[PDB]
Amino acid sequence: VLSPADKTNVKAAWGKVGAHAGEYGAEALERMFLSFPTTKTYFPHFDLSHGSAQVKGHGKKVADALTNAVAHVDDMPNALSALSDLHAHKLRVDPVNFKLLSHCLLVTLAAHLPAEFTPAVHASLDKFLASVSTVLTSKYR
Amino acid sequence: VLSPADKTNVKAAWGKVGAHAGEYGAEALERMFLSFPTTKTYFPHFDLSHGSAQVKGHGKKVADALTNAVAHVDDMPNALSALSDLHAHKLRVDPVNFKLLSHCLLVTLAAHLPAEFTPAVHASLDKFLASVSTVLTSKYR
Amino acid sequence: VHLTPKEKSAVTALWGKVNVDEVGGEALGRLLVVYPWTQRFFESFGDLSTPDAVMGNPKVKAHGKKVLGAFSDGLAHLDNLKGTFATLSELHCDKLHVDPENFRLLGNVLVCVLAHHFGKEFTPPVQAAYQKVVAGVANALAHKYH
Amino acid sequence: VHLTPKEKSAVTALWGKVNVDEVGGEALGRLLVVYPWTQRFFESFGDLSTPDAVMGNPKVKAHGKKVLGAFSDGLAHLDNLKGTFATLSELHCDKLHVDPENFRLLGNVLVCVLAHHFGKEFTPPVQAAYQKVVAGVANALAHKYH
Numbered sequence A, B: 001v002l003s004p005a006d007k008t009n010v011k012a013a014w015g016k017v018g019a020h021a022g023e024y025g026a027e028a029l030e031r032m033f034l035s036f037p038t039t040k041t042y043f044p045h046f047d048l049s050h051g052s053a054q055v056k057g058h059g060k061k062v063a064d065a066l067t068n069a070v071a072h073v074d075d076m077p078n079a080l081s082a083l084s085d086l087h088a089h090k091l092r093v094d095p096v097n098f099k100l101l102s103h104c105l106l107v108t109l110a111a112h113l114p115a116e117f118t119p120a121v122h123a124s125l126d127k128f129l130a131s132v133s134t135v136l137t138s139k140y141r
Numbered sequence C, D: 001v002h003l004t005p006k007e008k009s010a011v012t013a014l015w016g017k018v019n020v021d022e023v024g025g026e027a028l029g030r031l032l033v034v035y036p037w038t039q040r041f042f043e044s045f046g047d048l049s050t051p052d053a054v055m056g057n058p059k060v061k062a063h064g065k066k067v068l069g070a071f072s073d074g075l076a077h078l079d080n081l082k083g084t085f086a087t088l089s090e091l092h093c094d095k096l097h098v099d100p101e102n103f104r105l106l107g108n109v110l111v112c113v114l115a116h117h118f119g120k121e122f123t124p125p126v127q128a129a130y131q132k133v134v135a136g137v138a139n140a141l142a143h144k145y146h
């Protein structure tokens, strides 16, 4: 589970992200679309080129949802309640895909926060993203 | 999540298992050891032959833990608290393995309860075993 | 996949008693019921709103028959599944973009359906041999991904 | 794995700037730290009680160097990874019985380590090419399973 230390690590690392949250969100998406092509099937109405305003705008949305999760890390189920319904019921996103996005998010942070991405924080972030993923697919199991 | 209907399906199907719970538990283990050889590395001190009293005795233990989970399906985290520590901290069981055992359990029930294993109950059982699995590996994420 | 003489014997012997009009539809329907996200691939099949709607869907029953045909074919060419599913691989991989994990799930649901239909006959050793077969088919189907 | 000329260029160019004494130990250590169950495979390595104990473990640093060597080798024989890892596959599969999902996890942790070390240089396209490589290595290592 998310231990007191994990909670602290996540809050600190995310705190470092600061204003670049939206940018890193767009970057993780772009990394996912390129490394894992299957994920693109979910975004037909999206132009997934490099300067895409659609991907830029969506990254901001993903970032804000994670900020919400960090701010309410002890009641994520409630906080993310609406997003689960969206991804599960409406979008039918394959559970496997949350792991690909999670990995791409970790890769983006590693590329932007050398000092913070220690093995310890890395493990905390992984558990955190794993917890966000569990909630978003909870309308399955 | 486990809906009111899922809860009902699980309670009913498990109710059918009745006294054969221990037997089906041993059978699922045997099915797992045979279909997925990697799982055997966790049982060096076990004779995994067909009439093994060790596997017979252990199946009873697995069955009783699932009975506990069904009896306290709304507070599984607490009920199974001790087993998680065992499998996660002490045994270091690879998470992937819970899916193999889960599948083998579903296969064993399908082979023993034709009337009950309807698509609906099948889906309820899968979510249930998925929930038991999440708790047993919670000392990870 | 390499099956032992006693294993191929177990598999084929069982596969012969299989109800081709039943099994296939039951496996695909249970997949759509048990793993809901897979429904995003068969929206054109009509109403998959409920399990009874899914299991009673003729399009589901019909496609299932096709799927089961692919397995029989794989059964005949175990020494060359990759070549046997090359066209299907291209289809599911390059065209549909189905994640490979789902080929594994269908294989296991198929195993559950056989256990349900054969009961005691589907012993652990027999399941073991079938797990090897569906494992091979899933890899072959995914081969266009690697 | 088939890499485009521009992709092989990206990969190799980056792999040359790689710190062989560092990267390898960092990847294996982070795997043991981030995915604790993997520690059951290196109990003989000593104390892996804490991340600092894991990252400072000389046995971990040393084995890591070996692992990274395997990747370089795979880098040179992309046209034949299966043949290149045949012996390693037999080792991890038949002897150690490591689940294939863990080869995937190590590959991704390796990707994270490279991103951490190269920062901006590790652009999305470059990661895309590396994901293809680690995907190939993981399959090759698992080939003794299918």
Ligand code: HEM
Pocket: A039, A042, A043, A061, A062, A065, A066, A083, A086, A087, A091, A093, A097, A098, A099, A101, A102, A132, A133, A136
């Ligand atoms: C870390 C997990 C994820 C988070 C935090 C997240 C968050 C979001 C948010 C906040 C939205 C916008 C909701 C709104 O407009 O009200 C959204 C939309 C969406 N997400 Fe995710 N998402 C996640 C993972 C995924 C994955 C793995 C996929 C699929 C590969 C996905 C596919 C979509 C799609 C298709 C939409 C709708 C886009 C549109 O039509 O505008 N999401 N997501």
Ligand code: HEM
Pocket: B039, B042, B043, B061, B062, B065, B066, B083, B086, B087, B091, B093, B097, B098, B099, B101, B102, B132, B133, B136
């Ligand atoms: C549905 C999930 C599972 C349940 C309900 C379950 C339940 C149990 C129970 C009740 C025990 C005995 C605890 C005691 O003696 O106090 C146990 C022990 C153990 N389990 Fe599990 N288990 C599950 C899955 C697994 C899996 C997937 C593996 C590994 C492939 C595993 C490996 C073990 C081992 C090695 C022991 C200790 C055996 C011994 O030394 O006697 N378990 N499990």
Ligand code: HEM
Pocket: C038, C041, C042, C066, C067, C070, C071, C088, C091, C092, C096, C098, C102, C103, C106, C107, C137, C138, C141
């Ligand atoms: C063991 C794996 C599978 C086998 C052997 C299999 C086999 C088949 C076969 C024989 C067809 C007919 C293609 C034709 O008309 O030539 C087909 C079509 C299709 N399959 Fe699968 N399939 C498998 C898994 C899946 C999974 C898991 C999904 C998605 C969750 C899927 C989605 C599709 C779709 C959407 C079509 C319809 C294509 C069309 O005819 O327009 N299949 N499959």
Ligand code: HEM
Pocket: D038, D041, D042, D066, D067, D070, D071, D088, D091, D092, D096, D098, D102, D103, D106, D107, D137, D138, D141
């Ligand atoms: C990308 C995947 C991996 C590669 C390329 C790799 C490579 C290697 C190499 C080069 C060796 C040295 C073998 C020798 O002395 O000839 C080795 C040993 C070993 N590997 Fe891996 N490995 C991988 C994944 C893993 C994973 C994920 C685990 C377990 C969680 C693991 C467990 C072991 C163990 C226990 C040994 C020690 C064997 C011994 O020397 O006694 N490896 N591996």
